[PDB]
Amino acid sequence: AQVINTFDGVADYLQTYHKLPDNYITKSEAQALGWVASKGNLADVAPGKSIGGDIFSNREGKLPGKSGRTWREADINYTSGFRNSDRILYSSDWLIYKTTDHYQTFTKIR
C-alpha cells in the first residue's frame, strides 16, 4: 500500500500538492465501508487508510480564524486499531498546525 502518514510527510505534501495523500478517507467514507469506531476496526475495512480530510470547526478558537478560511484535519501516525491523539490541521490558505495532545495545544509547523 501507498502510505504517507507522518507530521512532516503530510505537511510537505499539503504544501506542495495542495491535497492530502491518497491514504486518507473521511469518517463518513469509512463509516460506509464498515468502520464502527468502538470496535477499532479501520484496518479491516480499509487497509492502509487513515481518517483525514474532515472539516475542523475550531471550536475553542485556538487556531487563526478569518473570513473565507476553512480548517480541516487528519490523523497522523496511524496504522491499525484505535485512533490516537495526533492530528494535523490545515487551512484553505495552507497554514499548517499540529496537535499531539488531542487538541489541547496546537503548534504551527509550516
Binding site: 464502527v36 469506531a37 481518517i51 475553542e60 491523539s85 495532545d101 488531542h102 489541547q104
Partner: protein, 89 residues
C-alpha cells in the same frame, strides 16, 4: 448507552469534561475541550448512546453558560448521523 449528567454537581466546565469522560468512556488521552469531544463523539464512542442531562439551567449558570456549547456538540454529532438520544430532564 445510558449516561446521566446531573447539572447540580457541575461546578465548572472542567468538572463537566471529567464527568463526560468517565460517563461516556472516553479515551484516556481525552483533551477535555470541545474539539476533543467532537472527535470522541464522531470517532471513538459506542452507539447507541443515550444521554440524560438532568437540571440543565443550573448547569448553565454554574458553567457560565458554557454547558450550552457542549450541548451543541452532541446535537451536531447527532445531525451528522451519530445514534445519540438527548433527554433534557
Amino acid at each position: 448507552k445510558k449516561a446521566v449528567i446531573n447539572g447540580e454537581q457541575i461546578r465548572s466546565i472542567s468538572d463537566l469534561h471529567q464527568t463526560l469522560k468517565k460517563e461516556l468512556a472516553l479515551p484516556e488521552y481525552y483533551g477535555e475541550n470541545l474539539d476533543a469531544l467532537w472527535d470522541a463523539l464522531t470517532g471513538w464512542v459506542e452507539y447507541p448512546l443515550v444521554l440524560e442531562w438532568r437540571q440543565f439551567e443550573q448547569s448553565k449558570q454554574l458553567t457560565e453558560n458554557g454547558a450550552e456549547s457542549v450541548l451543541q456538540v452532541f446535537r451536531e454529532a447527532k445531525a451528522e448521523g451519530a445514534d445519540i438520544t438527548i433527554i433534557l430532564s
